[PDB]
Amino acid sequence: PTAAEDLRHKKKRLTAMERVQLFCDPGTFRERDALVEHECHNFGMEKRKVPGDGFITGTGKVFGRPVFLFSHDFTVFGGSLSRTNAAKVVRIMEEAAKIGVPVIGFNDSGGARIHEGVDSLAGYADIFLRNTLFSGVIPQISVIMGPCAGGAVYSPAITDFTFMVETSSYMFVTGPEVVSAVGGKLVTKDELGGPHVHATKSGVSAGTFPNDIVAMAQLRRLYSYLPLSNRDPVPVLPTADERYRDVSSLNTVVPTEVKEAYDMRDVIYPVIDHDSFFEIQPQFAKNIICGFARVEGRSVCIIANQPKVQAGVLDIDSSVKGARMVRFADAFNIPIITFVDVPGFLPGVQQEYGGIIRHGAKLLYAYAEATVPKVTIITRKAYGGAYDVMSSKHLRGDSNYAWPHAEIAVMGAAGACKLLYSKETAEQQAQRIADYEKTFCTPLSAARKGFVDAVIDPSETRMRVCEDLERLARKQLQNPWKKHGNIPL
Amino acid sequence: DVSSLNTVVPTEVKEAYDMRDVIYPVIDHDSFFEIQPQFAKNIICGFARVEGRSVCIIANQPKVQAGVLDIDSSVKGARMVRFADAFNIPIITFVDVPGFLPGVQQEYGGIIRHGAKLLYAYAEATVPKVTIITRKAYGGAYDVMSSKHLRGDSNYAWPHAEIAVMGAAGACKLLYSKETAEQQAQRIADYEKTFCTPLSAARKGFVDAVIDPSETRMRVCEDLERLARKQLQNPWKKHGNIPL
Amino acid sequence: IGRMEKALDEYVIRGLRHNICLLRDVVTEPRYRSGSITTNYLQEQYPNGFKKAELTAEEMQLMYEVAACVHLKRERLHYTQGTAPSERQLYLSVGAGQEGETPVYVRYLDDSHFEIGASKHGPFRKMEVVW
Numbered sequence A: 001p002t003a004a005e006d007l008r009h010k011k012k013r014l015t016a017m018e019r020v021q022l023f024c025d026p027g028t029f030r031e032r033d034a035l036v037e038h039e040c041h042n043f044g045m046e047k048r049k050v051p052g053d054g055f056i057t058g059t060g061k062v063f064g065r066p067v068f069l070f071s072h073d074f075t076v077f078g079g080s081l082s083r084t085n086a087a088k089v090v091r092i093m094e095e096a097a098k099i100g101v102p103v104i105g106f107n108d109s110g111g112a113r114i115h116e117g118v119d120s121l122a123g124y125a126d127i128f129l130r131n132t133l134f135s136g137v138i139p140q141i142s143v144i145m146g147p148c149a150g151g152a153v154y155s156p157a158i159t160d161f162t163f164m165v166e167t168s169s170y171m172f173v174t175g176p177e178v179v180s181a182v183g184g185k186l187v188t189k190d191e192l193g194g195p196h197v198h199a200t201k202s203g204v205s206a207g208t209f210p211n212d213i214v215a216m217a218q219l220r221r222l223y224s225y226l227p228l229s230n231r232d233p234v235p236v237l238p239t240a241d242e243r244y245r246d247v248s249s250l251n252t253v254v255p256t257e258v259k260e261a262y263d264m265r266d267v268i269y270p271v272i273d274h275d276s277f278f279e280i281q282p283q284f285a286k287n288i289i290c291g292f293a294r295v296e297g298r299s300v301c302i303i304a305n306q307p308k309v310q311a312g313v314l315d316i317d318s319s320v321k322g323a324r325m326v327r328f329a330d331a332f333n334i335p336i337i338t339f340v341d342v343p344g345f346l347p348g349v350q351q352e353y354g355g356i357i358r359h360g361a362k363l364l365y366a367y368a369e370a371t372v373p374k375v376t377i378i379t380r381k382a383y384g385g386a387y388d389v390m391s392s393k394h395l396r397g398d399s400n401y402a403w404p405h406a407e408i409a410v411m412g413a414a415g416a417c418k419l420l421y422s423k424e425t426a427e428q429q430a431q432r433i434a435d436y437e438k439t440f441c442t443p444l445s446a447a448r449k450g451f452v453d454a455v456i457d458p459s460e461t462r463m464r465v466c467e468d469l470e471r472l473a474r475k476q477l478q479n480p481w482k483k484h485g486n487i488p489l
Numbered sequence B: 001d002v003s004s005l006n007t008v009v010p011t012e013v014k015e016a017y018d019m020r021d022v023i024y025p026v027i028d029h030d031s032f033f034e035i036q037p038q039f040a041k042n043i044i045c046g047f048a049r050v051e052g053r054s055v056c057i058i059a060n061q062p063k064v065q066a067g068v069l070d071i072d073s074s075v076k077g078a079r080m081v082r083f084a085d086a087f088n089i090p091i092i093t094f095v096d097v098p099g100f101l102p103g104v105q106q107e108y109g110g111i112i113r114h115g116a117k118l119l120y121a122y123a124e125a126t127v128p129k130v131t132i133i134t135r136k137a138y139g140g141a142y143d144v145m146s147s148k149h150l151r152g153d154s155n156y157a158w159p160h161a162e163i164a165v166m167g168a169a170g171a172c173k174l175l176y177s178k179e180t181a182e183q184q185a186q187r188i189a190d191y192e193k194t195f196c197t198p199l200s201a202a203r204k205g206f207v208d209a210v211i212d213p214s215e216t217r218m219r220v221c222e223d224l225e226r227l228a229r230k231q232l233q234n235p236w237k238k239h240g241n242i243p244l
Numbered sequence C: 001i002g003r004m005e006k007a008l009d010e011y012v013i014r015g016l017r018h019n020i021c022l023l024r025d026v027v028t029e030p031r032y033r034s035g036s037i038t039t040n041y042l043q044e045q046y047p048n049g050f051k052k053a054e055l056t057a058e059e060m061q062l063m064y065e066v067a068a069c070v071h072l073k074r075e076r077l078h079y080t081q082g083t084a085p086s087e088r089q090l091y092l093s094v095g096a097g098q099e100g101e102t103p104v105y106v107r108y109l110d111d112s113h114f115e116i117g118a119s120k121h122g123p124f125r126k127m128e129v130v131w
């Protein structure tokens, strides 16, 4: 019996129920509500009632841990929401708020249902309020499998992570017809809101998958990292890997020349456990890396610069990416580990015309507000305000480390030499820049002041990180009483 | 395996059955401790274990007086629910009620006060609740016996249930004042067919799902395992004001 | 030679390419094990570029079995406490077009022992994998 799904598969596409079956465990899905009708009675809609009413909501179970989910249905009315569709979603989110369980939704709606009038707006508003209230209480993940247009786009935005499917998905606020009507330009749906556009240009989508099957397979892996609720502790899984594994290849990663580049992944991979990195937003703002990883069987958060791309310089997009990652990680009590290599901020008129001052402050706010244990490692250099922003010791950092060839200075040697000698005799470059770099572009001064705990061999990083992260397991820090902060938007 | 539940409910609507035949299969073997066994026999209350954890049982009984709510039954159920909630004990209820007991003595004795106690106890409670509607639920009795709107966790019904405002006769009378005589035969049957069935209540969203009677143990164990860590709180009060 | 064969496969090199495939193919060739060779041997046996020899049916079957065992072992790691499975039915097929769908079972009787078979109600072999 394979009835009524032949029409769907013929278009090389899967069904909502099949997606739900693929996500959860083999036999642990219990559909909650299945016999519900729209009761519209307008515009010749009194007929063609549907039992499911276009939504599939259940409970399920992943890796032995509970979950909640819902999936849109494209065959029935195009997946449009109504006064009645939104009730099921509201009930699921409320139940997942009472119990410490997350929510995952597979969006496929074609837009609002016009035949209901303003009831669709009512349902949208209720879903928006539930998302707003419960953000930071239970993790929310959203996946977009098909078209997603109109005002329905906003609820995925408030969710913590949004993923996209490559061939047959798109998302935008207004359709290309209106764009043609007002501006006069003919742009296709994919050219407007395709997965690539949101992966590279707008920065909304947190990832892209080639197929639905791969999407489910990796969504399970992502779910294996998250904590169940706000009050539950960070999960710890058994692992045969051990902190005594030898990592001596880190002694040679940093080149002896100051103008040559290297890949920061060569430093990230040895420290964490084998094959346990899940990069977030891999194709957007490549000069910074963010993602999840495990250290001795417990999930941690990774944020590191990359001198491979644009000399590892902070920017607007990198600031937004890092700020969102830090805020989410702190909201759910996940340790943060950072690797620092920054020469400063990206210079340019477009930057000031785009508001670098606002955006660069977001990362600093996220780092200063955080109360989870932090570990910082300075590999090569840290200059100016970039050193302050990237989790400096003064921002209530727990432990800070440096490598023997690091440099921590106010600015580059040339600018310091220029400002320290206004009209000093010519040729001052040769006998002053070298001396200043020798005397003050070294971690000795910063260690004398007390800004780094110790200068360590690069081969001891795994040992030190495991020791510190084990000791810091029970830190309790609290901020002054506030209704909420006022972050620079 | 519990497949004997498929046959407990008779196919006639005027025949009676023993609710213990439904209570005993779901709970673990030889683990029932009835409370007040000889008083207000139309309602059963007691303690029982489900998968090794103690729960509270409150069910109607159509054997005695057609399973009709009353003063004494209301007091008994109210006290049991209040005690069970005070100490964080899950509550499981089985529903079969045609309404309240009609009589002058009842109003002369204050049915209004006493019947409100059970409703207050059910609404105030914050422990996980599971409700199963076997055959019927009419009028305010459906509201009182842990309906889904009183912050109930999960509600289930059996395929031959009935959830209506009142009996078919009264509805037919009120819906057609002076309609042509013999209206009984071609109206009561139609109304009972169309609206005395769980399809309408399922359409509205008042029952989670319609289940086979053989899956009750599975569903109850699953729900009671999942609901182990619910945290609900009432608004701040020095204390309530229950109708004494 | 056998020693070399075995020792070639245990040389883990990551971060750059190498010619171990050529050495393996040359050693495994029956011409090399015949006893005598020549100095024009290489280009005589490699006329157009280089193309590594393929796998026989039993080798590919063994690779399938080991892949299924590894998949199950790594799957059991992620589950919490005792809520973990012990048997599945997998469908292995190499290539982008699923060439040669081979149903496989697995039982995981111990930490490093399985009961691989064709499917359910099929004879089992009880191989061993240590990884």
Ligand SMILES: O=CCCCC[C@@H]1SC[C@@H]2NC(=O)N[C@@H]21
Pocket (backbone or CB within 6 Å): A313, A343, A344, A345, A346, A347, A412, A414
């Ligand atoms: O010496 C002249 C140019 C030096 C730029 C050095 C890098 S480029 C971006 C960033 N902004 C700075 O002031 N320094 C760094």
Ligand SMILES: O=CCCCC[C@@H]1SC[C@@H]2NC(=O)N[C@@H]21
Pocket (backbone or CB within 6 Å): B068, B098, B099, B100, B101, B102, B138, B166, B167, B169
């Ligand atoms: O049809 C006439 C009598 C129907 C009574 C049905 C039962 S008796 C007690 C309870 N109260 C009602 O209104 N209906 C039920």
